[PDB]
């Protein structure tokens, strides 16, 4: 660890801490927490705290059920903002069934469960360099978000308004004050779109420093005067924020995907991870692009991967082997979006990655250029297939795949479906304003 | 299709 | 005991307090008090300050009725938001006949009265450990409540950030200084319905804390310019606020409900509490659910119970048996709500429970299969009886029941009943607006 | 009956 | 008698 029970406390003490948020992450990926006063720090870290665990299952809960919240001592932080009758810290926790066993339903454990799947196989380290975009909408005189964009800047542009120019700054200089190992920031194409790119790490450290990230990117975004919306395709007409994930298996403490004298310096192990990933691609989309809006993001053009093929060079490839080799070798799954669950995501990918590894699967043709330029029928015959189009054409493809079950285990799985299924069905029965402009006065 | 996205690229630059 | 007299006079002097409320709770829960200058403290602690006794009967009071006012030396608590002319403090005072006898008709004593039976019956402490939920409205310029929620939150979510808001904090941390002990807290199921939880304590010491609490929320919630409200089901079709009640009958510093060597590890004793309580479920409903609105909170679905049955895993049951054992084996009764007079809810809950342990009753069998999939007429075939539908269909059960009439004395049972049919009767001869939205245009 | 309250439960979530 | 002032005694207590 990096903090020991005596490390923490003392730090609490000298920091006049008074409020602690034991926080976790549900099945919908929305950040939850049970909040205690520093006076209970003790019962906290003695793993003796309790809560209604059916609050992880989103709105589809059924019978309140007492779970224990063990806090990962390393994911401790003292927010710079709070301090206002004391400072306000936190801890990220694992969710335990009553009988000292994990909660097979924790998105975080499910992941330490699929990583356990990993070490069994021989690998040690799964790592995640991520690419999370987020818009920034100007707020008005009431305090609510409006659909005005913070600035007019394009791809990698320079100064575009100080609200972003010094937001991606106030965020960044701030994000640093909380052990963030952030690589490079830059402005993204669609007006308002932003990107903070941070040093790769352990899957668990990764989807954690990610959840961390949204809380923060939404506060300093709001303290500056705007809404920082992580919504996939907030605006039709324009580009969407997407969450590319950079995958890389290690083992022995060496990159497993790097292969000095082979085809694209890609280790065999690499081709399995790449071949497998391509197999379940249209199955695990449900999890990776988990919302009605996600699929409006995967439209033609706007750089989004619409099909399913790999390339080290293409408009929109579903994976991507980036340049660098050395330790750096890695797979980019451009598909994912900030909406998806940092946990369930990693969970599914890392499981269709391993599938391809334990089972020796054949990766299809590196697609070069003939695809996009291609047509959706001749594109079939090729190891290439469209990615769903609605969060339902998405669910179907996920229930049919027996390795995504195994990936989420019956409890996340079963409840996840029952839920999106309702998400979808809320959107379906609803008569959208669109239907009326077109059909109100015509027919 | 890029002609769409490219078309969905250009609407940004030429404004 | 905790504070002796010279201990109180030591703080009045040092801390410098200029006024002293002498709290006591009436029949309808309103927390009342006579108020004396610190100049009178002597005479008070000698138990000599007197008041109009009938003020407890509530509105149905009839005759000046001199009562003396004994201050529980221990309850002494100095409020902090006070300065300005000296500080303020309060002694919760029991009530006493003008010939030094306890006043049979004061809620608070009646509890000490019933826990007399309890120590006459072999037990040492009958521990309550409450879960009082609530709502917050945003005040208007005229400083008046509105139908506006202070937030659009949900279950255990990271309710209003570290930034500016979280009344929960000012609410929570405040209670810290005053000597409270907050388990945890979390935003509840509906928009602006929050929940705070303390640690358990003998009924006396606890129901005293539900009262103090309700003060500190309502008064801290106002500094923040927001209405607080423990009303039962304030809005239509939005989570009701409930006061989950956790009961643990000990005996020999030992939890009586515990029995490792047995089934569910529940002591035969604990089966006697749970069974006996299922008998008068619908009988003491009127009390624990003392208001007209509780019944718009007692609708199937919103997670609020209706049907008399127990389990440890079922949606909305009447009695719940939490999972953690050892010292924490406790029979949670979920029909109660904040409206309920603590001392009066405990009196009826314990007495209804202490019936089962002295006529050794038999638990009926827990319902885990489910009642919410059954029909009203189907559940009826087993020990499952619906709860009342009104404060009125209820009063006919609290009257009928000879045992509750032994939890509340000829005095309190009378005026509680006296008062609730003028209540119910005030609400049934009215001509509400729905009655116009239904019967003015059609008929 | 859990369809009224889960139904309110989803009316808070989806609004 | 008392039922009109009490009748009032009550009206404000209950509003
Ligand atoms: N820098 C990028 O990869 C741009 C991605 C684009 N916003 C989508 O996908
Ligand atoms: N059980 C819960 O915590 C839900 C809250 C609701 N106000 C009742 O029940
Ligand atoms: Mg990028
Ligand atoms: Mg006796
Ligand atoms: Mg609760
Ligand atoms: Mg409860
Ligand atoms: Mg028997």
């Amino acid at each position: 660890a990096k903090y020991t029970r005596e490390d923490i406390e003392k730090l609490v003490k000298e920091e006049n801490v008074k409020y602690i948020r034991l926080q976790f992450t549900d099945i919908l990926g929305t950040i939850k927490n049970v909040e205690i006063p520093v006076s209970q720090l003790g019962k906290a870290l003695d793993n003796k705290v309790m809560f209604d665990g059916s609050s992880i299952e989103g709105f589809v809960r059924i019978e309140e059920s007492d779970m224990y919240l063990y806090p990962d001592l390393n994911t401790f932080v003292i927010f710079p903002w709070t301090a206002e009758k004391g400072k306000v810290a936190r801890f990220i926790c694992d969710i335990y069934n009553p009988d000292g066993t994990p909660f097979e339903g924790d998105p975080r454990n499910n992941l330490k469960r699929i990583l356990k799947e990993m070490e069994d196989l021989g690998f040690s380290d799964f790592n995640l360099g991520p690419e999370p975009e987020f818009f920034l909408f100007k707020l008005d005189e009431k305090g609510e978000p409006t659909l005005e964009l913070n600035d007019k800047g394009g791809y990698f542009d320079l100064a575009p308004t100080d609200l972003g120019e010094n937001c991606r700054r106030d965020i960044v200089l701030e994000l640093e004050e909380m052990g963030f190992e952030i690589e490079a920031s830059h402005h993204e194409v669609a007006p308002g779109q932003h990107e903070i790119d941070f040093k790769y790490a352990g899957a668990v450290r990764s989807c954690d420093d990610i959840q961390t990230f949204k809380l923060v990117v939404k506060t300093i975004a709001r303290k500056h005067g705007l809404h920082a919306t992580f919504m996939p395709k907030p605006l039709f007409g324009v580009n969407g924020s997407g969450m590319h994930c950079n995958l890389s298996l290690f083992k022995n403490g060496v990159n497993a995907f790097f292969d000095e004298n082979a085809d694209l310096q890609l280790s065999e192990t690499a081709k399995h991870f790449i071949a497998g990933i391509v197999k379940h691609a249209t199955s695990f989309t449900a999890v990776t692009n988990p919302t009605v809006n996600s699929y409006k993001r995967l439209v033609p053009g706007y750089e989004a991967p619409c099909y399913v093929a790999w390339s080290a060079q293409n408009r929109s490839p579903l994976i991507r082997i980036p340049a660098s080799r050395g330790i750096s070798t890695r797979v980019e799954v451009r598909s994912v979006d900030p909406a998806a669950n940092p946990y369930l995501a990693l969970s599914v990918l890392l499981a269709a990655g391993l599938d391809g590894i334990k089972n020796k699967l054949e990766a299809p043709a590196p697609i070069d250029r003939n695809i996009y330029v291609m047509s959706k029928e001749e594109r079939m015959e090729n190891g290439i297939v469209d990615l769903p189009a609605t969060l339902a054409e998405a669910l179907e493809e996920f229930k049919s795949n027996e390795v995504m079950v195994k990936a989420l285990g019956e409890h996340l799985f079963e409840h996840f479906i029952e839920a999106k299924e309702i998400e979808w069905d809320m959107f379906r029965t609803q008569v959208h304003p669109w239907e009326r402009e077109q059909y109100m006065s015509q027919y | 299709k890029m002609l769409e996205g490219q078309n969905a690229h250009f609407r940004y630059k030429n404004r």
Side-chain angles (χ1 to χ4, degrees), chain A, chain B:
Chain A
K2 77 159 193 169
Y3 288 98
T4 178
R5 212 159 170 212
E6 344 115 62
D7 282 310
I8 303 294
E9 318 218 21
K10 217 228 96 273
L11 235 187
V12 179
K13 148 151 66 182
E14 235 116 330
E15 234 42 52
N16 205 36
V17 156
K18 296 296 180 69
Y19 209 64
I20 301 177
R21 315 185 145 317
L22 291 181
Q23 121 216 179
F24 53 99
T25 298
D26 70 13
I27 205 283
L28 282 164
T30 266
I31 180 67
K32 305 306 187 59
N33 89 319
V34 41
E35 53 214 55
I36 86 264
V38 44
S39 302
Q40 299 266 99
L41 179 53
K43 181 194 153 98
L45 304 149
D46 269 313
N47 295 40
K48 287 297 160 195
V49 166
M50 264 205 279
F51 73 116
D52 172 7
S54 54
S55 60
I56 272 140
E57 305 182 319
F59 44 107
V60 320
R61 12 178 323 261
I62 288 205
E63 315 130 314
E64 163 205 358
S65 39
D66 323 329
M67 226 73 62
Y68 273 82
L69 230 37
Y70 301 1
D72 190 281
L73 253 311
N74 318 273
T75 58
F76 158 59
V77 176
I78 290 171
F79 290 140
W81 343 292
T82 58
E84 64 349 65
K85 193 47 104 74
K87 258 272 147 83
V88 182
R90 81 90 144 70
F91 288 90
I92 278 290
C93 308
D94 291 312
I95 313 173
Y96 277 55
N97 311 313
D99 59 356
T101 29
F103 185 22
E104 80 112 287
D106 193 12
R108 177 186 216 264
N109 284 134
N110 188 48
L111 210 198
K112 305 155 162 288
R113 171 181 145 305
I114 289 294
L115 282 157
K116 247 192 289 172
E117 205 182 74
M118 181 211 204
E119 318 176 323
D120 270 36
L121 266 114
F123 302 97
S124 88
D125 307 304
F126 197 38
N127 292 351
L128 214 198
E131 297 173 28
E133 321 177 309
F134 60 103
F135 279 78
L136 271 193
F137 292 122
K138 277 178 76 193
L139 287 148
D140 76 345
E141 358 57 6
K142 267 183 76 168
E144 304 263 43
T146 96
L147 307 167
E148 252 249 55
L149 281 166
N150 164 51
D151 64 303
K152 293 184 298 294
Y155 200 37
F156 278 70
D157 273 312
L158 238 179
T161 286
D162 200 281
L163 285 307
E165 195 198 311
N166 220 277
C167 214
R168 257 198 274 87
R169 283 205 250 240
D170 215 285
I171 276 283
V172 170
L173 285 308
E174 287 271 33
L175 284 183
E176 280 277 307
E177 290 204 358
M178 288 185 16
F180 251 71
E181 303 192 42
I182 77 109
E183 215 87 306
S185 142
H186 60 86
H187 186 286
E188 270 244 22
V189 229
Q193 205 168 39
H194 291 272
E195 196 165 10
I196 314 304
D197 303 338
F198 43 164
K199 284 227 295 284
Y200 73 109
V204 243
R205 164 103 201 253
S206 195
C207 329
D208 246 350
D209 279 343
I210 280 185
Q211 298 278 91
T212 290
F213 188 57
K214 306 166 166 181
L215 275 49
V216 194
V217 160
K218 305 208 70 156
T219 284
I220 303 288
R222 167 174 284 289
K223 195 156 168 294
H224 279 220
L226 347 130
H227 191 9
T229 218
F230 279 107
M231 194 166 167
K233 188 84 168 188
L235 291 159
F236 142 59
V238 244
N239 257 33
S241 35
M243 183 174 79
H244 305 347
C245 298
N246 290 287
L247 306 200
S248 38
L249 273 154
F250 266 40
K251 74 163 300 296
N252 289 6
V254 345
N255 202 347
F257 302 169
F258 172 52
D259 184 279
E260 323 79 35
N261 327 56
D263 290 46
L264 292 77
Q265 279 165 296
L266 298 186
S267 55
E268 271 299 321
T269 311
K271 317 254 60 224
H272 294 122
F273 197 91
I274 293 180
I277 284 277
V278 186
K279 191 189 184 200
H280 320 274
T282 73
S283 299
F284 73 60
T285 312
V287 161
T288 53
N289 287 61
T291 47
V292 181
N293 182 265
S294 263
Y295 312 91
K296 319 256 216 169
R297 161 176 130 105
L298 278 22
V299 183
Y302 323 85
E303 207 166 0
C306 297
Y307 313 110
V308 167
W310 61 291
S311 326
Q313 178 82 259
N314 234 265
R315 161 104 246 190
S316 302
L318 181 67
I319 305 86
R320 188 179 101 73
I321 294 63
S324 60
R325 284 307 99 138
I327 354 292
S328 313
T329 320
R330 56 201 149 48
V331 202
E332 180 144 331
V333 186
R334 300 171 72 285
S335 131
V336 190
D337 76 39
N341 209 288
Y343 296 93
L344 312 191
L346 255 283
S347 292
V348 322
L349 289 145
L350 174 66
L354 281 163
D355 198 58
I357 297 184
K358 78 219 287 56
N359 299 127
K360 322 200 93 55
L361 278 32
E362 310 108 273
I367 234 53
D368 283 84
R369 180 67 232 165
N370 29 309
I371 41 290
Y372 240 85
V373 286
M374 250 184 186
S375 315
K376 122 104 221 187
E377 246 100 2
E378 64 184 286
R379 170 192 307 135
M380 255 71 278
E381 36 185 276
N382 312 190
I384 325 175
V385 161
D386 300 300
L387 275 176
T390 48
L391 170 94
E393 217 256 8
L395 287 184
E396 293 285 295
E397 279 300 303
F398 181 77
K399 323 192 225 211
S400 94
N401 196 316
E402 206 230 282
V403 1
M404 290 303 118
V405 164
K406 318 293 289 290
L408 291 195
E410 334 249 337
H411 193 292
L412 280 74
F413 181 76
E414 265 190 30
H415 271 113
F416 178 58
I417 281 181
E418 143 184 15
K420 293 302 178 192
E421 300 187 312
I422 269 305
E423 180 152 354
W424 165 247
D425 156 77
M426 274 253 37
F427 170 87
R428 142 181 155 66
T429 76
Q430 256 308 284
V431 189
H432 306 303
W434 186 105
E435 280 135 82
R436 287 188 293 255
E437 290 163 338
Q438 327 295 296
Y439 316 132
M440 184 66 156
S441 297
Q442 195 249 38
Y443 299 120
Chain B
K1 305 179 173 210
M2 293 161 35
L3 198 272
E4 294 220 359
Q6 235 17 77
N7 202 177
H9 220 236
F10 301 120
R11 40 206 300 202
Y12 312 97
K13 262 312 304 182
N14 298 291
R15 284 180 183 190

